Design a protein around this ligand. Sequence first.
Ligand SMILES: *[C@@H]1O[C@H](CO)[C@@H](O[C@@H]2O[C@H](CO)[C@@H](O[C@@H]3O[C@H](CO[C@H]4O[C@H](CO[C@H]5O[C@H](CO)[C@@H](O)[C@H](O)[C@@H]5O)[C@@H](O)[C@H](O)[C@@H]4O)[C@@H](O)[C@H](O[C@H]4O[C@H](CO)[C@@H](O)[C@H](O)[C@@H]4O)[C@@H]3O)[C@H](O)[C@H]2NC(C)=O)[C@H](O)[C@H]1NC(C)=O
Ligand SMILES: *[C@@H]1O[C@H](CO)[C@@H](O[C@@H]2O[C@H](CO)[C@@H](O[C@@H]3O[C@H](CO[C@H]4O[C@H](CO[C@H]5O[C@H](CO)[C@@H](O)[C@H](O)[C@@H]5O)[C@@H](O)[C@H](O)[C@@H]4O)[C@@H](O)[C@H](O[C@H]4O[C@H](CO)[C@@H](O)[C@H](O)[C@@H]4O)[C@@H]3O)[C@H](O)[C@H]2NC(C)=O)[C@H](O)[C@H]1NC(C)=O
Ligand code: NAG
Ligand code: NAG
Ligand code: NAG
Ligand code: NAG
Ligand code: NAG
Ligand code: NAG
Ligand code: NAG
Ligand code: NAG
Ligand code: NAG
Ligand code: NAG
Ligand code: NAG
Ligand code: NAG
Ligand code: NAG
Ligand code: NAG
Ligand code: NAG
Ligand code: NAG
Ligand code: NAG
Ligand code: NAG
Ligand code: NAG
Ligand code: NAG
Ligand code: NAG
Ligand code: NAG
Ligand code: NAG
Ligand code: NAG
Ligand code: NAG
Ligand code: NAG
Ligand code: NAG
Ligand code: NAG
Ligand code: NAG
Ligand code: NAG
Ligand code: NAG
Ligand code: NAG
Ligand code: NAG
Ligand code: NAG
Ligand code: NAG
Lengths: 131, 131, 131, 440, 440
Amino acid sequence: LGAAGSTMGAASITLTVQARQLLSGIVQQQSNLRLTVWGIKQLQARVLALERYLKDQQLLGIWGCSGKLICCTNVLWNTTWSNKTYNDIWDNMTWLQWDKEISNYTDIIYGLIEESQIQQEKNEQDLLALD
Amino acid sequence: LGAAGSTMGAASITLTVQARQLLSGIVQQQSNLRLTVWGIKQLQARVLALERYLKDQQLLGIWGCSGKLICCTNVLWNTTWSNKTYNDIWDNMTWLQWDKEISNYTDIIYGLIEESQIQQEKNEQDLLALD
Amino acid sequence: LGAAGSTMGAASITLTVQARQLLSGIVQQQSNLRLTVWGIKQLQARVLALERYLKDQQLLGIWGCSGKLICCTNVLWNTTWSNKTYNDIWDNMTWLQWDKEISNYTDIIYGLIEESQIQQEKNEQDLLALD
Amino acid sequence: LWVTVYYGVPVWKDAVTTLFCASDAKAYSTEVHNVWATHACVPTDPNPQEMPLENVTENFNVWKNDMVEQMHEDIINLWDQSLKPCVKLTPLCVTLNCSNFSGEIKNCSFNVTTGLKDKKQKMDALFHRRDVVQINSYYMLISCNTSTMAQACPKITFEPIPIHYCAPAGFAILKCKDKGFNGTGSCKNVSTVQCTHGIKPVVTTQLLLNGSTAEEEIVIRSENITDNARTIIVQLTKPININCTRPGNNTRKSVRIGPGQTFYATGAIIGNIRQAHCNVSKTEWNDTLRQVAEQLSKHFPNATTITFANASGGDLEITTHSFNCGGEFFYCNTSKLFSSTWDNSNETITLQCKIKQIINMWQQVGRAMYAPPIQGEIRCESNITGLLLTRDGGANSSTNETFRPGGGDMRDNWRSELYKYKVVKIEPLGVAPTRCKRRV
Amino acid sequence: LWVTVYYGVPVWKDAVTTLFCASDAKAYSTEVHNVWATHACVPTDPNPQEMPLENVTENFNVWKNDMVEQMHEDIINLWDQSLKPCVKLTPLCVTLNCSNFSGEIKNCSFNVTTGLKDKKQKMDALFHRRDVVQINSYYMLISCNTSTMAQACPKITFEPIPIHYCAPAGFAILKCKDKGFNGTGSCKNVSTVQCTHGIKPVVTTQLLLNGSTAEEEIVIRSENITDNARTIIVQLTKPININCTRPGNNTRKSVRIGPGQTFYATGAIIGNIRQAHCNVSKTEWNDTLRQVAEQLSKHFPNATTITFANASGGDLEITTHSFNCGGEFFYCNTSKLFSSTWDNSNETITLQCKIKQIINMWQQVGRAMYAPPIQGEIRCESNITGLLLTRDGGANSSTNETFRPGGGDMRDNWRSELYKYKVVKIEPLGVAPTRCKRRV
Ligand SMILES: *[C@@H]1O[C@H](CO)[C@@H](O[C@@H]2O[C@H](CO)[C@@H](O[C@@H]3O[C@H](CO[C@H]4O[C@H](CO[C@H]5O[C@H](CO)[C@@H](O)[C@H](O)[C@@H]5O)[C@@H](O)[C@H](O)[C@@H]4O)[C@@H](O)[C@H](O[C@H]4O[C@H](CO)[C@@H](O)[C@H](O)[C@@H]4O)[C@@H]3O)[C@H](O)[C@H]2NC(C)=O)[C@H](O)[C@H]1NC(C)=O
Ligand SMILES: *[C@@H]1O[C@H](CO)[C@@H](O[C@@H]2O[C@H](CO)[C@@H](O[C@@H]3O[C@H](CO[C@H]4O[C@H](CO[C@H]5O[C@H](CO)[C@@H](O)[C@H](O)[C@@H]5O)[C@@H](O)[C@H](O)[C@@H]4O)[C@@H](O)[C@H](O[C@H]4O[C@H](CO)[C@@H](O)[C@H](O)[C@@H]4O)[C@@H]3O)[C@H](O)[C@H]2NC(C)=O)[C@H](O)[C@H]1NC(C)=O
Ligand SMILES: *[C@@H]1O[C@H](CO)[C@@H](O)[C@H](O)[C@H]1NC(C)=O
Ligand SMILES: *[C@@H]1O[C@H](CO)[C@@H](O)[C@H](O)[C@H]1NC(C)=O
Ligand SMILES: *[C@@H]1O[C@H](CO)[C@@H](O)[C@H](O)[C@H]1NC(C)=O
Ligand SMILES: *[C@@H]1O[C@H](CO)[C@@H](O)[C@H](O)[C@H]1NC(C)=O
Ligand SMILES: *[C@@H]1O[C@H](CO)[C@@H](O)[C@H](O)[C@H]1NC(C)=O
Ligand SMILES: *[C@@H]1O[C@H](CO)[C@@H](O)[C@H](O)[C@H]1NC(C)=O
Ligand SMILES: *[C@@H]1O[C@H](CO)[C@@H](O)[C@H](O)[C@H]1NC(C)=O
Ligand SMILES: *[C@@H]1O[C@H](CO)[C@@H](O)[C@H](O)[C@H]1NC(C)=O
Ligand SMILES: *[C@@H]1O[C@H](CO)[C@@H](O)[C@H](O)[C@H]1NC(C)=O
Ligand SMILES: *[C@@H]1O[C@H](CO)[C@@H](O)[C@H](O)[C@H]1NC(C)=O
Ligand SMILES: *[C@@H]1O[C@H](CO)[C@@H](O)[C@H](O)[C@H]1NC(C)=O
Ligand SMILES: *[C@@H]1O[C@H](CO)[C@@H](O)[C@H](O)[C@H]1NC(C)=O
Ligand SMILES: *[C@@H]1O[C@H](CO)[C@@H](O)[C@H](O)[C@H]1NC(C)=O
Ligand SMILES: *[C@@H]1O[C@H](CO)[C@@H](O)[C@H](O)[C@H]1NC(C)=O
Ligand SMILES: *[C@@H]1O[C@H](CO)[C@@H](O)[C@H](O)[C@H]1NC(C)=O
Ligand SMILES: *[C@@H]1O[C@H](CO)[C@@H](O)[C@H](O)[C@H]1NC(C)=O
Ligand SMILES: *[C@@H]1O[C@H](CO)[C@@H](O)[C@H](O)[C@H]1NC(C)=O
Ligand SMILES: *[C@@H]1O[C@H](CO)[C@@H](O)[C@H](O)[C@H]1NC(C)=O
Ligand SMILES: *[C@@H]1O[C@H](CO)[C@@H](O)[C@H](O)[C@H]1NC(C)=O
Ligand SMILES: *[C@@H]1O[C@H](CO)[C@@H](O)[C@H](O)[C@H]1NC(C)=O
Ligand SMILES: *[C@@H]1O[C@H](CO)[C@@H](O)[C@H](O)[C@H]1NC(C)=O
Ligand SMILES: *[C@@H]1O[C@H](CO)[C@@H](O)[C@H](O)[C@H]1NC(C)=O
Ligand SMILES: *[C@@H]1O[C@H](CO)[C@@H](O)[C@H](O)[C@H]1NC(C)=O
Ligand SMILES: *[C@@H]1O[C@H](CO)[C@@H](O)[C@H](O)[C@H]1NC(C)=O
Ligand SMILES: *[C@@H]1O[C@H](CO)[C@@H](O)[C@H](O)[C@H]1NC(C)=O
Ligand SMILES: *[C@@H]1O[C@H](CO)[C@@H](O)[C@H](O)[C@H]1NC(C)=O
Ligand SMILES: *[C@@H]1O[C@H](CO)[C@@H](O)[C@H](O)[C@H]1NC(C)=O
Ligand SMILES: *[C@@H]1O[C@H](CO)[C@@H](O)[C@H](O)[C@H]1NC(C)=O
Ligand SMILES: *[C@@H]1O[C@H](CO)[C@@H](O)[C@H](O)[C@H]1NC(C)=O
Ligand SMILES: *[C@@H]1O[C@H](CO)[C@@H](O)[C@H](O)[C@H]1NC(C)=O
Ligand SMILES: *[C@@H]1O[C@H](CO)[C@@H](O)[C@H](O)[C@H]1NC(C)=O
Ligand SMILES: *[C@@H]1O[C@H](CO)[C@@H](O)[C@H](O)[C@H]1NC(C)=O
Ligand SMILES: *[C@@H]1O[C@H](CO)[C@@H](O)[C@H](O)[C@H]1NC(C)=O
Ligand SMILES: *[C@@H]1O[C@H](CO)[C@@H](O)[C@H](O)[C@H]1NC(C)=O
Ligand SMILES: *[C@@H]1O[C@H](CO)[C@@H](O)[C@H](O)[C@H]1NC(C)=O
């Protein structure tokens, strides 16, 4: 999380860092080697840390971005999702204040992402190779 | 599950739909924010929903189909696994009655799938690049 | 685990075998269909079997080897990590006695693996396509 | 203009999850099973990785941090897990024909049950005046008509142990390293950690013992200063050395109201009949109190007056200093500390302390715990770090200002260690437009 | 020279995880709820896949295998889960005006409580001499001044059931198939399994019943032979046929010390007044003992002497053979078995056995269990497979050698079934240099 205050272009240089401390909680406690409050608290926390990871990898999967941390898509960026340029976004703003500016339309984009491409592109792709 | 009653060709156009409601149970209950019956029931159910997902992705992995939802293989379709054509299967039958017709030989096919290719193709592939 | 005593070249021909009995514990017990000692013991064991799997796939992901069981990298093998040849390693030694010989430097290699390539190669790769 | 996915963006939101324990594993093969560490607490990390965060402007909130409630819930739960299996003091509410001991303490005589049921036990014991009340005169334990009394096992200790509350992956603990940090609001220096530092569950009222130490100036934190109903909590920068001693050389006697139900009481003590007390260096106390008056004048007019008075009314925990000391519960007359007057411009003081064996803390009607006696003279020492003050309220404004000690809630003690902590959940899904596009 | 990753390499390390149960599901719709199987144990695999491992040289350690401790913990836990909800025998420690029965067994008279509280119950019962002690003379149950007595439910059985302890994925159970296998050290023939075989939790002292059978020669296993403090455990290769019978046709009487608290005692028995006993074929015993003397001479000089004597001192479990038999606990006089002398070169024997209803096994001060009576004459048979011997220690070396039966710990019984097992964790991350390299 070192680049949490850097520009989006600068921050985009350490995505492995955010990737590490999101899935592995088993180095810190693979077991701790029983109805105590601590046992239930620990177990529910360990499940949640991988439960959240599997939701995001699930979204990347159904969007055809399973293998990659950075994937480009075909959906257009509608300018109503704020008018800016490449440099005004990637070299002067941080991902925090960016996520706040685009948090309004994240749902609409997700709906287009799953339908417009990976479901039209793939369905036409299945009908093309399945011929 | 909208295309559950459509033809296999028609149904094959919405595999993301079956993919979504199989892995993410954490939108419905990432936590619910303690020995009650409901706590144990919830936790065991949440684990099972990702436990089943990891079994199927595991099979696709050891079959060399990890990244894709649709993969083609090298194993021949033995005609004893029922005699039909492409159109009699994909444009007139649903996946339900199809899975019932082929449920008899799913095990044999899985054994050939893991051995015949992804273990002969990959082992010869390791001996070819490792030279 | 059939090739556990074979040479590394011979053993490298059955990685699916070690891959199978590492992730799926849900065929043996998807549920067992409640505060007994056996319920907690079972649940913690089932979580741990997929918890360990997700740690290793996590490391392969942040090293850019997500989709593959065998991946080649760019980091040099420093000869201080023992001096041997291809044949003295792959056709006369087993993975067990090999892992014992290299267990000393596994940490250093992991640090170089995540930084030297997948973080320099990918960051320069992001700056090249993001241009 | 094309949407692009970036998994693992440094973006988070405000939420709360199921935290858990983390304490260094001490074998303690001779004496184990303290309530907080239990049979197993998760071990800590050998190297506490503390990563600073630059250009991070975030508002902390201690008075609304739900971690304080979750800790307060886990404490009461951990206590209840240690009171159920031990002896249920129901074969003890008998008529106590007490005689004045050779006045607090009473020498009583009563009839109990032996290992047999029909065979009764004619025995004696010794308790404090706040343990029984009359109905010579006949006495009965105070909690016999309210809450179920149950003796705690003599093996489980009550000594506080540091707890490092953590958070799983996907969640993070933000630490504000601001020295001059008002309790809430923005913090210029925010850092992130996976676990907190050593926090002792110091079950105490008014005087906070063995707590955290502020930096530079004595920090003053209150949810609302102009509201007298809100309890003001302070955090000192210089730890004092307070000493409480029970100079009574008590003895433990073991009766058998079984089967299996063993009861340890107080027998004929040795040494001297010396009541409980504590010591406070008058010089350092007066020196520390003057710094308090110099810090209280920052929320009041420049030329004013600060008046200190003892406790008004309420229970003996609200009026006297409640705390633990080697197993016994001490309650001290803090009237000699709070009786001064301060304008704009080498001996020690002692406080009369009382000991109670039947505790009813948190005011849970229905359940009760008995403190087993402790052998030998007890001597405890601590560092007082915080205080729970309270205004008087309705009066002519800016005339005089009076401050009295309070203790309306026990959660205020957990606020003294969680003022610079905050749990946030990581949102790694990032969407940003780039000139890049996918294939066909 | 380039580093390469190989996920899934046959590499493992020594560790331990949370094992669990595995037992075949028997409906038992008429009588269910034995303590070990509980309401649910995980089912087994229909085909036990046992994969052998070639060229695998690994050292096993039974005396340091933590699986024995984890089993011993789960056993005591499973027992406690079956003793809490049943009747707490506290309305039973009354004065017992006992008369000598028409001497062990006593015909007692006492006053209890009925369904009402003020209405008391004038009733009788029958127990053994080791159940009550005096204070005619008046008696009291022995454990009424020590541990809380609590009757077990008459529905939960105590018959052992085979348990197949497993290990989750990422962990494996290694089985050493060496016939002539010393307890610890390297093993030429190592195999891997996911679960163990049928292991009965045979709660017994000295004589091991219904245990595993060694191969070829009778295996001798001891942590240290020259240390008399270490208990030596043996594993036979030929199972014997031992028969224990309680020829007393007892009857069960149901009193009501309720509400809900029902108590089943022993009434006027039928048949004959015949004490408990066991049978041992003197020919096979003498034949088996001779093979023991021929195996003991492998850890001693060639021309020596082996002396057998009865138990020295200790509790009645250390001196007599403790074991279960249809619900009742039997304790036999094993003095007639251990009284022989052996140099270098068709009837049956009987042993006087006693029955105890109030058990205090594992020496847990505070808790106790009562064995409910069993109707009809009891007859049990088993195969003795192991023995817990003990030297006398300090004496002139290599003169004579004396061996006495011991039973200092119950974990020694679990060692008899876990001597060829070992848990290891799989490390699938492999790094090896190849001439291969990635792209740019
Ligand atoms: C704020 O913080 C301060 C400081 O942290 C707290 O002060 C603590 O108070 C508690 C009581 O509330 C004390 O606990 C007691 O400690 C005694 C001393 O413990 C040590 O010594 C014991 C005896 O050993 C002595 O002899 C040997 C050999 O001659 C010497 O080397 C050694 O130094 C001693 O002089 C040891 O047995 C023990 O393990 C420690 O090493 C104990 O006497 C006492 O009980 C003992 O006996 C019990 C009966 O068997 C047993 O159950 C205990 O485990 C223990 O053995 C008790 O533990 C702390 O010692 C004291 N200091 C610290 C650093 O914790 C203060 O209480 C706190 N404020 C509040 C409100 O909590
Ligand atoms: C070492 O191993 C040996 C062998 O494994 C152990 O020997 C076992 O000892 C235990 C006692 O400790 C015995 O348990 C008892 O079994 C009795 C027999 O069980 C069967 O028969 C019952 C009656 O059926 C009879 O009649 C029918 C019809 O005529 C016949 O077909 C049948 O063969 C019988 O002749 C059945 O009810 C029962 O289900 C079995 O089929 C039982 O009589 C006894 O209790 C019965 O009644 C109870 C009261 O309702 C009930 O709760 C029980 O469930 C049961 O029904 C009790 O169970 C074992 O039988 C005996 N053998 C085996 C193979 O286990 C030895 O104990 C062990 N050593 C140690 C130290 O444990
Ligand atoms: C914080 O901002 C300053 C200037 O605004 C910049 O120099 C510095 O690199 C920033 N820190 C981070 C971590 O981005
Ligand atoms: C960067 O952001 C600030 C604040 O929005 C703005 O004032 C400034 O003009 C921006 N500069 C560039 C080069 O985009
Ligand atoms: C978010 O969008 C909604 C409608 O899409 C609009 O009403 C709302 O004002 C927007 N919020 C902001 C902060 O722009
Ligand atoms: C159901 O069948 C009818 C005709 O057989 C068809 O028109 C319709 O599309 C089918 N529905 C689905 C969901 O496939
Ligand atoms: C489709 O299925 C039905 C039922 O099996 C069959 O009668 C029909 O002939 C099929 N039609 C085609 C075109 O395959
Ligand atoms: C399934 O296959 C088995 C043998 O492979 C055969 O005996 C059985 O009849 C088949 N079932 C059906 C419904 O065809
Ligand atoms: C064991 O070693 C022998 C010779 O050393 C070899 O022939 C055999 O294949 C090896 N077994 C395995 C499983 O590698
Ligand atoms: C294989 O290993 C053995 C033991 O290290 C060694 O003696 C032998 O020379 C090696 N042979 C080859 C061909 O590498
Ligand atoms: C492992 O490496 C360390 C330093 O890197 C060295 O001190 C140690 O001796 C090495 N161990 C072996 C077995 O070579
Ligand atoms: C209580 O004690 C007093 C003083 O010994 C005695 O006179 C009186 O009889 C006692 N009463 C009872 C009920 O024991
Ligand atoms: C206890 O009981 C006896 C007789 O039952 C009586 O003499 C004695 O005074 C009682 N003790 C008390 C303290 O009441
Ligand atoms: C119990 O008795 C005391 C003194 O007799 C009294 O103060 C208290 O109120 C009583 N408890 C209740 C619940 O009334
Ligand atoms: C934050 O830290 C810097 C140096 O580490 C210091 O100069 C600054 O005063 C700190 N901020 C506050 C509010 O104390
Ligand atoms: C502390 O002071 C800051 C600024 O002076 C203010 O924003 C904040 O609300 C204050 N906190 C409290 C609890 O009064
Ligand atoms: C504190 O409470 C008083 C009422 O007694 C109110 O007037 C004042 O606004 C409150 N302060 C804050 C910061 O809300
Ligand atoms: C207290 O009362 C008991 C009653 O028998 C008596 O023996 C004892 O001497 C009295 N005093 C003390 C200090 O125990
Ligand atoms: C408390 O006791 C310690 C140890 O004797 C001493 O150093 C300290 O000055 C004492 N403080 C007071 C206030 O008595
Ligand atoms: C002690 O208190 C008095 C009264 O306010 C004050 O004048 C004096 O300076 C104080 N001395 C110290 C050492 O604090
Ligand atoms: C507080 O002090 C006053 C006199 O200074 C006294 O009357 C009152 O009882 C004291 N209160 C307590 C709780 O000691
Ligand atoms: C506390 O002390 C003050 C003065 O030292 C005294 O007036 C008051 O009565 C005391 N309180 C108690 C409960 O002893
Ligand atoms: C308490 O009394 C015992 C017995 O006389 C003595 O050994 C011990 O030193 C005494 N302890 C204190 C603190 O007076
Ligand atoms: C109290 O403070 C002193 C000096 O600041 C320190 O040495 C001691 O460890 C502190 N005690 C506790 C319990 O923190
Ligand atoms: C005990 O039994 C004997 C023999 O019947 C009788 O004489 C005696 O009175 C009895 N005692 C009691 C207390 O019941
Ligand atoms: C039971 O009580 C009655 C009267 O209460 C008495 O006569 C009888 O002897 C008692 N029984 C025993 C065994 O003591
Ligand atoms: C209970 O009584 C028996 C016999 O009276 C005695 O042997 C035993 O030691 C007593 N229990 C305890 C804990 O002293
Ligand atoms: C291992 O097995 C082989 C054949 O399966 C046998 O020849 C050999 O003696 C066995 N090893 C031992 C130590 O018994
Ligand atoms: C068993 O014998 C082997 C070799 O004779 C030895 O290595 C091992 O330590 C022995 N085990 C014990 C428990 O003595
Ligand atoms: C067994 O204990 C004796 C001491 O009685 C010691 O001399 C011997 O070395 C021990 N044996 C082993 C194998 O450690
Ligand atoms: C035992 O004592 C009871 C007491 O009433 C009597 O009825 C019975 O006959 C005696 N004998 C037997 C064998 O129960
Ligand atoms: C035990 O009983 C069985 C069944 O009658 C019999 O076969 C066996 O010989 C007996 N053994 C002994 C030692 O009595
Ligand atoms: C019985 O024991 C005697 C005494 O050692 C021995 O001479 C004889 O051979 C034994 N017989 C059998 C059948 O074991
Ligand atoms: C052991 O035997 C001797 C005589 O052979 C006897 O005196 C002693 O009581 C016996 N011990 C036991 C526990 O039976
Ligand atoms: C056991 O038997 C021996 C001889 O058969 C005898 O000397 C001893 O007293 C008996 N022990 C008991 C407890 O009956
Ligand atoms: C026990 O007694 C009953 C009643 O007479 C009889 O039916 C049964 O057969 C007897 N059983 C034995 C083993 O003597
Ligand atoms: C005892 O051994 C015999 C023959 O070896 C066998 O038939 C029987 O099943 C065994 N009994 C048990 C309980 O294992």
